[PDB]
Structures are given as C-alpha cells and as structure tokens.
Amino acid sequence: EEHPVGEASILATFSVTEGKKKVPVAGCRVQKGQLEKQKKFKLTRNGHVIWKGSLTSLKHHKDDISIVKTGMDCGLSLDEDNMEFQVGDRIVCYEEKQIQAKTSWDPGF
RNA sequence: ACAGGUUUGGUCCUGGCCUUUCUAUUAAUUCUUAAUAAAAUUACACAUGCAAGUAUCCGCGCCCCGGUGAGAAUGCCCU
RNA sequence: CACGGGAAACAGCAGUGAUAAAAAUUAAGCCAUGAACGAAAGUUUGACUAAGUUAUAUUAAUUAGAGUUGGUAAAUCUCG
RNA sequence: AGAGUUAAAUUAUAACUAAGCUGUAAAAAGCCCUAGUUAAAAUAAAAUAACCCACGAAAGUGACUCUAAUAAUCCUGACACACGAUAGCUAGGACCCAAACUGGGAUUAGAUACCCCACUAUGCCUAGCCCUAAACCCAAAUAGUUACAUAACAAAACUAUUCGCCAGAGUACUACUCGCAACUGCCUAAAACUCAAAGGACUUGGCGGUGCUUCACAUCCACCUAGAGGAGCCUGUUCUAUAAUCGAUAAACCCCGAUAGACCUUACCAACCCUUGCCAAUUCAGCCUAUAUACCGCCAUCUUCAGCAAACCCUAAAAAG
RNA sequence: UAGAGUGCUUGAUUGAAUAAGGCCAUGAAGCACGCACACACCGCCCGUCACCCUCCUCAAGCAUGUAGUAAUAAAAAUAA
RNA sequence: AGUAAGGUCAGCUAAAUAAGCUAUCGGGCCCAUACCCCGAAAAUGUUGGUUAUACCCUUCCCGUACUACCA
RNA sequence: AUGACCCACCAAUCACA
Ligand SMILES: *C(=O)[C@H](CCSC)NC=O
Ligand SMILES: [Mg+2]
Ligand SMILES: [Mg+2]
Ligand SMILES: [Mg+2]
Ligand SMILES: [Mg+2]
Ligand SMILES: [Mg+2]
Ligand SMILES: [Mg+2]
Ligand SMILES: [Mg+2]
Ligand SMILES: [Mg+2]
Ligand SMILES: [Mg+2]
Ligand SMILES: [Mg+2]
Ligand SMILES: [Mg+2]
Ligand SMILES: [Mg+2]
Ligand SMILES: [Mg+2]
Ligand SMILES: [Mg+2]
Ligand SMILES: [Mg+2]
Ligand SMILES: [Mg+2]
Ligand SMILES: [Mg+2]
Ligand SMILES: [Mg+2]
Ligand SMILES: [Mg+2]
Ligand SMILES: [Mg+2]
Ligand SMILES: [Mg+2]
Ligand SMILES: [Mg+2]
Ligand SMILES: [Mg+2]
Ligand SMILES: [Mg+2]
Ligand SMILES: [Mg+2]
Ligand SMILES: [Mg+2]
Ligand SMILES: [Mg+2]
Ligand SMILES: [Mg+2]
Ligand SMILES: [Mg+2]
Ligand SMILES: [Mg+2]
Ligand SMILES: [Mg+2]
Ligand SMILES: [Mg+2]
Ligand SMILES: [Mg+2]
Ligand SMILES: [Mg+2]
Ligand SMILES: [Mg+2]
Ligand SMILES: [Mg+2]
Ligand SMILES: [Mg+2]
Ligand SMILES: [Mg+2]
Ligand SMILES: [Mg+2]
Ligand SMILES: [Mg+2]
Ligand SMILES: [Mg+2]
Ligand SMILES: [Mg+2]
Ligand SMILES: [Mg+2]
Ligand SMILES: [Mg+2]
Ligand SMILES: [Mg+2]
Ligand SMILES: [Mg+2]
Ligand SMILES: [Mg+2]
Ligand SMILES: [Mg+2]
Ligand SMILES: [Mg+2]
Ligand SMILES: [Mg+2]
Ligand SMILES: [Mg+2]
Ligand SMILES: [Mg+2]
Ligand SMILES: [Mg+2]
Ligand SMILES: [Mg+2]
Ligand SMILES: [Mg+2]
Ligand SMILES: [Mg+2]
C-alpha cells in the first residue's frame, strides 16, 4: 500500500557543474508534509505522473539534509537525466507500508 | 571369430564404435497343464509363534546344524 | 576385541515395517537320512523329508502369442 | 678451455669541398651537429678457401698463434651423475651495428601489420641461474645379412641381443599432485563430458593475387573509327499506384513471349447471368489452377570448344592410367 | 493488322581509319608446382564478442562421521 | 557571472569566382555485397549600417578553452 | 575483404505355353 508522506512544488531550475557533469537541479518548496531521502518519489505534471524513483541528491543550502520539513526549500537532483523539470511541476514523496494478507480460502467446516 | 556394418568425391592403410553368439536379473506384452531344479534388494528396524534337549536326580549336549557376505586384499597351495 | 559402554538385537523357519528395478507358506511330519541324549526300547530336532507358492530354467504335451520386414539381417503392400 | 693477436668493413673525431643527405612500387616523416673525399682508436663480427665434409656425446664448431686436450682391450643400461640451441633472469662491465617494445611517416574501410625513420630491452664480456626447441637426419644402441620380398609416399628389405616408448578422437604441452636457485616457470600428467569418427598416403577433377613458355586479331594492353552515359522525345524494366493478368528478369532479362493490347485479342477487375455445360457415346464434358524441382516438345549457354563413346587389350592392381 | 512501332527481317547505294607492336595489369592454351577444396574459391575455414545450457575445477567457510600411545599391578600370602 | 579567440554546408576545413574533404541520397564498378570511382542537393548564425569589395565595425544570439560561482 | 544451411547414385525387365 502506497500512503503519502510529502508534497513539494518546483519553482526554479538550476544547472550546476560538479565533476565536469552538468546536473539539473529542481528548486522545490515543500507545501504539505515532509520529504525524506530514503523514500520513493513520483513527479506530477498538471495531474499526469511523469516519473517514478528516488533522488540522487537532496541538498538544502550547501547542506545535505535527509529530512526537509514543511515550508523548507530543497534542491533535488534525480538519477534520471531524461527527466525534464519545468517551472510549475508538482512532486509527491510517498512511502510503502506492507499489508499481510491471510488466506482467501475459508474451509467450509 | 569364418566374420560383418560405419571415416572418403573416391581408393588404400591405420584406428575406434557397433552388429551377429551364450547366460542371469528386472520390466513391458502374452500365458493351458504337469514334473524337476532354483528361489536372490537390503550386516536397516522387527509384532507373534516355533527353531535344544535328553536322562532315575549327576551329567552330556545347546551358532554343531542352520544363516549371512559385513569386514579384511583378505588370501590359494604347502610346511 | 567386549572386561566395560551404547543399549535391549530373526544375518535360524516363517512372517512384518522401512527400503529397492527386485515380492515363496505366519504350512505338515519326525516316516527316511543326519545330529543330541539314553544301557535300552525311545524321545527331541523350522536340519531335513514330503508338500505349498512363482513362467526363473529345462523337459513333456493338452497350450498362441510376441518381435520384426531400408542396409548390416530372414521378411511389405495400400493408405495417412 | 684458457691466454695472446687482427685483415676487410664500420664509427667517435677533426680537415677540406658541396647544399642538400636518407628513403621507397611511389611518397612522407627523419637529418641537414648532414653528405663525398682524406685521416682514425674502441666495440662487434669473422669475404674467398668450402664444388670441402672434418671434429665433438649431443647442443655445437670453419680469422690467426701458442698452452692444455678429445673415457673404455670399446655389448645393452636408469628416474642416479654430468651436459644441453635460441630466448629469458640476477649482478657488474661493454655498445660499432642489429633490434622485440615504443614514438613518428605512409598504406588501408580499419592497420594496434606488411613498407620508411628513430630509439630501447636484448644480441657481447665476467660470474651465477634457467633446462626449453620442427633439441627432427621426425629413422633408438650394438652386431650382422642382401636371402624371402613391393599397401601408398618417403631415405630399399630384414635378422639377433637389449632398452625406451605406444591401447580411438577431442578435452589436454590442461586440472590436481611430488620435485626443482624455476613463483606468468619446467617437469610428471588425469577425469567428467563430447563425438562416431579422428588420423595416414594416394587418385581424378576443380582452383591458384604460383612459375615458365606460347598466344589474343575486334582483342586483353598499346592503338583506330562511330556511339552510349548529359537534352527532348519513343519504347521496356523497376518501383511506387490501382477493384484490376501472367511469363522473362547476371553473362544467358530489359522494342523480351508480342512479325504487335481501342472492342475483340484477354488470360485480369467489377457487376450481372448459365449449370451433362462445343463432341457419336460416356456418374461426364470443362479448367490460361499448382508444380518448368515430374516432363515431351522447342531453345539459351559454355561453343567455331574439341572432344564424347561402345567393343577389346595392357598395369608386381586398376580410385584410375 | 481493319487500322496501328522511332520495333523487327531483308535488299541496295556511297564508303573509311588503325593493326607490321606488347607480355607489366585482364583473359586463353600447354607444361611444371601447390591444395586442409570435391555443392569443387561464390570453396573451405580461425578467434573474440553476444544468446542460452551442460560438466569439471578452485573457493572464506559450514555441516556429518572418523581415533592414540606411557609405565604400572597382578604373584604373594594368611589361617588351619 | 567574467575572459579570450572565435561562428563559412549535417561534421571539419579553404578563401572572397561562395569552394574543397567526411556525412547524406543517386549513379557506376562487381556474379553480388562492401571498399573504391563519379554526380546531386547541401550556406558566411538573426538585428543595424555602409561603402569601388565584404573576410570592416555594431546589435541580438550562440557556443566553446579559461577562470570564478552555483541545490 | 566477404559469400546460412542443405543436394546426389543401394530398385528391377520384356516375350511365350
Ligand atoms: C537551495 O539551496 C534552495 C533553492 C531552491 S528555491 C528555487 N533553497 C534552500 O534550501
Ligand atoms: Mg578420413
Ligand atoms: Mg559418403
Ligand atoms: Mg573396423
Ligand atoms: Mg518378475
Ligand atoms: Mg556357511
Ligand atoms: Mg580396507
Ligand atoms: Mg562383536
Ligand atoms: Mg527370516
Ligand atoms: Mg540367533
Ligand atoms: Mg514389506
Ligand atoms: Mg526374483
Ligand atoms: Mg505381490
Ligand atoms: Mg529322525
Ligand atoms: Mg529316530
Ligand atoms: Mg514341527
Ligand atoms: Mg665509444
Ligand atoms: Mg621532408
Ligand atoms: Mg674471415
Ligand atoms: Mg675415444
Ligand atoms: Mg653403456
Ligand atoms: Mg641453455
Ligand atoms: Mg643471454
Ligand atoms: Mg646487464
Ligand atoms: Mg643497446
Ligand atoms: Mg634500425
Ligand atoms: Mg604506428
Ligand atoms: Mg672466458
Ligand atoms: Mg639442430
Ligand atoms: Mg621425437
Ligand atoms: Mg639407448
Ligand atoms: Mg593396435
Ligand atoms: Mg581420453
Ligand atoms: Mg612446452
Ligand atoms: Mg603445465
Ligand atoms: Mg592428481
Ligand atoms: Mg570491343
Ligand atoms: Mg546519335
Ligand atoms: Mg551521348
Ligand atoms: Mg540520354
Ligand atoms: Mg511486368
Ligand atoms: Mg504460371
Ligand atoms: Mg516472375
Ligand atoms: Mg540466367
Ligand atoms: Mg480489353
Ligand atoms: Mg471483355
Ligand atoms: Mg479462367
Ligand atoms: Mg529446367
Ligand atoms: Mg577427335
Ligand atoms: Mg600402382
Ligand atoms: Mg580408359
Ligand atoms: Mg506499320
Ligand atoms: Mg605441402
Ligand atoms: Mg580430399
Ligand atoms: Mg573467399
Ligand atoms: Mg562479415
Ligand atoms: Mg559457403
């Protein structure tokens, strides 16, 4: 079961040069909830879902921070280079909890 | 072995594999009756019954027969 | 090896679990041979004798089915 | 094995002279502190003789001189002993010239090659290792014979005494062991598994960017003439296109089946129609349906190529010639 | 062919140039030589890589099973 | 962000007749593919200005080596 | 420079009574 953790809207897109590699950076503002580094993420464009996966780098003001709270600005670089970050995109951080099912079989007796 | 098939476009040589014979176990398919012979997966575990007594007391018999091939290169033959 | 120790013994005849491709009777007699004991008549003996079971093999007849038919290697026709 | 020596080259290095020298099928790069001549140590390597066939156990040894020297009254014999080409390793010395590597230059689709230039390890000396070669004259040592006698090819066939080896092919000069100055090593040397062959020699073809001869007569080069390939048309292919045939489709198709399509032709497409439906008869006519890889008929092609083939005969065996 | 070609098949007219060489590249013949080819060079064939599968080996380690020698004492006696 | 060279065709390059090598398509060669040999199309980045010329200067884009700095 | 795989020789007549 996928239950939601946090949601953040992108604002500005940056190109940062580290180790001779241009890294697209999504500047984000966390609206409702929080974002955590280990959780799974999905990107949302005007109601569509563009991407599924985990960040490469979540970095906030020259510090790498595992958990950004609400109202916190956070830089986000994905591992997927094919992903395009626009000015108005939405981002949903979700966590997966495990539901343990019992037998669908009930013996008559 | 009285031999035969098979290397190659072909021939010779060399060289393996296989066929043909005979027996035993198992299996498949078939199966009428006798006789004789033989009876065999297992040194894994065993319900029950029987397998050692005789005899005027002592005594004498009681893995001898029977079982098995576990172990051991054990050993054969011979002093 | 067997003082000891694991532990509670069919590798006697039958049987039975397990196991394996592997499947004989939980049978009758001491009448004959052998063995034990007895001075002896005799008793005992799943040794054994006579039977039961089984195409495992031979033989005898009452029994016909299996395999094979391109070559080696006996033997074929029409369909699919 | 020692010690000593050096003729021909080559080079450091000067002296003149010249602007180039080097280098290839052809260039480039390199060098001009280069080249030619005249002078020259060291180092390394040993024309001719050798058309000889000697020495050594083998590996090996062919400039000159001297010293020392080539086991056994001579059968075979190891895993024991002592040696063992090149490469390679360690340490010290040498360095003319050659040269793995590497760097440049060409070449090429690429070229981590062949070709060009530079230069190194290394080739040399001393000392120690290493122990391998197509270490193959693929033919064991020692005595013999030339009798019997052809698988093939090759270097003719064999006896006796020995020793060493070999039991399909791969897997495999591999994996594991033991030993070894070897540590990417040598030696010794399996099995699972896979296959139904793997090998040896020959035969006739075909082929060969193999060599030597001889040619080409519209024929390859050399050469002559007129054209094609560019334009417009004509006509055929291929595609694409259509509801809308088929066949040819390297040489050996492409104004080809057609010396011939407006209807017909005609096989195609679309609508419609007809079911003993060309004929003397026939549970029969009819089919331009499939197969040209079942065929006959006609041909193309090698080809203006010279061979094919029956019947025989010959060959210490014959596939064939 | 009724008609349909710049096509085809035939007849005729005017009417040249060059070749007297070459074996280096192409091709042909003969002879040598080679062949791992024989569907016969449009032949055959080698290794990586890629896709699966089989089997051996080597593995830090882990399970289960597996046992030794050393000197002794023991031949001495009591009571009847 | 600054700096310096720069921008000629899809890629690199020459010059000022707008061209040559690869890429691309199309022909040819070959029994056939590939190499190879030809042919075609392919533009001086958009703004502005001139002149006997644009390879002069500017605007707005651009990129690149170099520095700084970027979540 | 290159050019899937696969291709081949293992059966006997006619005629007469
Ligand atoms: C990064 O540092 C962040 C910038 C994103 S806002 C566009 N601000 C704070 O963490
Ligand atoms: Mg063979
Ligand atoms: Mg054959
Ligand atoms: Mg044989
Ligand atoms: Mg049975
Ligand atoms: Mg016994
Ligand atoms: Mg033993
Ligand atoms: Mg015991
Ligand atoms: Mg029993
Ligand atoms: Mg007992
Ligand atoms: Mg049972
Ligand atoms: Mg049985
Ligand atoms: Mg039964
Ligand atoms: Mg009795
Ligand atoms: Mg009695
Ligand atoms: Mg009884
Ligand atoms: Mg010197
Ligand atoms: Mg030069
Ligand atoms: Mg000399
Ligand atoms: Mg001597
Ligand atoms: Mg000797
Ligand atoms: Mg040596
Ligand atoms: Mg050396
Ligand atoms: Mg040295
Ligand atoms: Mg040197
Ligand atoms: Mg040199
Ligand atoms: Mg080079
Ligand atoms: Mg010396
Ligand atoms: Mg030699
Ligand atoms: Mg040898
Ligand atoms: Mg010898
Ligand atoms: Mg043999
Ligand atoms: Mg083997
Ligand atoms: Mg070797
Ligand atoms: Mg080895
Ligand atoms: Mg071993
Ligand atoms: Mg001509
Ligand atoms: Mg004309
Ligand atoms: Mg023309
Ligand atoms: Mg034309
Ligand atoms: Mg057509
Ligand atoms: Mg047809
Ligand atoms: Mg056709
Ligand atoms: Mg043809
Ligand atoms: Mg018509
Ligand atoms: Mg009509
Ligand atoms: Mg029809
Ligand atoms: Mg034909
Ligand atoms: Mg003739
Ligand atoms: Mg002959
Ligand atoms: Mg003949
Ligand atoms: Mg006409
Ligand atoms: Mg040869
Ligand atoms: Mg052959
Ligand atoms: Mg070839
Ligand atoms: Mg290829
Ligand atoms: Mg082929």
Pocket of ligand 1 (CB under 6 A): A 11-12, 27, 60-61, 73-75
Nearest nt (C1') to A64 (CA)?
F71
CA distance A80 to A10: 17
- Declared resolution, Å: 3.1
Q: What is the DSSP string of chain A?
A: -EEEEEEEEEEEEEEEESSS-EEEEEEEEEEEE-EETTSEEEEEETTEEEEEE-EEEEEETTEE-SEE-TT-EEEEEES-TTPPP-SS-EEEEEEEPP-----S-----
> Tokens in use for A57?
């780098």
A7 neighbors A91 (Cβ within 8 angstroms)? yes
The owner of tokens 């956070």 is A74
A60 Cα–ligand 23 center, Å? 68
